[PDB]
Amino acid sequence: PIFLNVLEAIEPGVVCAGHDNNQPDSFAALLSSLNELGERQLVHVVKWAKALPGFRNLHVDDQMAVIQYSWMGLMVFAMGWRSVTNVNSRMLYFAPDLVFNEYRMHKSRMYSQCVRMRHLSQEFGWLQITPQEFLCMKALLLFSIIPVDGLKNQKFFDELRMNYIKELDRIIACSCSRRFYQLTKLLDSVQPIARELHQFTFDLLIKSHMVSVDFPEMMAEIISVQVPKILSGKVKPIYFHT
């Protein structure tokens, strides 16, 4: 099981937000901590993606683009997994030092987005997603959002994505169609969540200095240059179902 060996081997370890849990929960503090967490996880996502089977087959520019478009979906998917794994789904396990209870979901001003993420977390439970289904789905997520004008080498991308789909199907196969159906619906359900988070972070970046939220430099760059391409519809998710 070469493919599965790789995905398991490359899976990132624990990442902390560096949040001060001893201090009363403010909007500014919670959101600055989520931003810092995002920046730290982006480093890990980049090294993960580069080690994925076939990833180096893409043009350098497509490598960068797929990561910049997909990171929100990928991080949310992993966060959902951690959440089923560690806590119990009233809660969102962003990091060991950054666990959201309902009170925090409210103070972050992200309550409804958090409700969507928790629904995702719960779905992993209800579908009884295996660790190996999780790993293959996460890999697929990196190849599920592209510019409508195409990538530099769209042909290699379409081939990469096909191969990850085949890998998910094998992991299922090893009825079957019911399971593939359910997993593809679950993958699709990540995309509305990512879209609402993209809107939210974009708004927050615009009004950031007003509300005293810090955006690390890499975060501010991607949210101002790449996230607006998704919100304006220049970059769109690939859905399995209509």
Ligand X SMILES: C[C@]12CCC(=O)C[C@@H]1CC[C@@H]1[C@@H]2CC[C@]2(C)[C@@H](O)CC[C@@H]12
**CA dist 10 → 5, 52, 53, 198 (Å):** 9, 8, 10, 27
**Shortest separation between residue 103's beta carbon and ligand X, angstroms:** 17
Q: Which of residues 91-110 bind ligand X (CB under 6 A)?
A: 94
Q: For ligand X, give the closer residue by CB, 74 or 186.
A: 74
135 binds ligand X (CB under 6 A): no
Token look-up 């081997």 returns: 9
79 makes contact with ligand X (CB under 6 A):
yes
Q: How far is the CB of 200 from ligand X (least distance, A)?
A: 5
Has 161 been labeled as part of a binding site?
A: no
Inter-residue contact 184 to 240 (CB < 8 Å) = yes
> How far is C-alpha 238 from the chain's CA centre?
14
Q: Which 3 state secondary structure label does DSSP give 53?
A: coil
Q: Are 175 and 222 in contact (CB under 8 A)?
A: no
Is residue 69 within 8 Å of 194, Cβ to Cβ?
no
Binding to ligand X by CB under 6 A, coded x per residue (else -) over 15-44, reads ----------------x--xx-xx--x---
Please report whether residue 197 would count as binding ligand X according to CB under 6 A.
Answer: yes
Q: How many residues bind ligand X (CB under 6 A)?
A: 15
Q: Please give the Cα distance from 183 to 240 (Å, whole number).
A: 10
CA distance 196 to 112: 9
Residue 85 assigned ligand-binding role: no
For residue 184, say whether it is annotated as part of any ligand binding site: no
What is the contact surface with ligand X in residues (CB under 6 A)?
A: 31, 34-35, 37-38, 41, 72, 75-76, 79, 94, 197, 200-201, 204
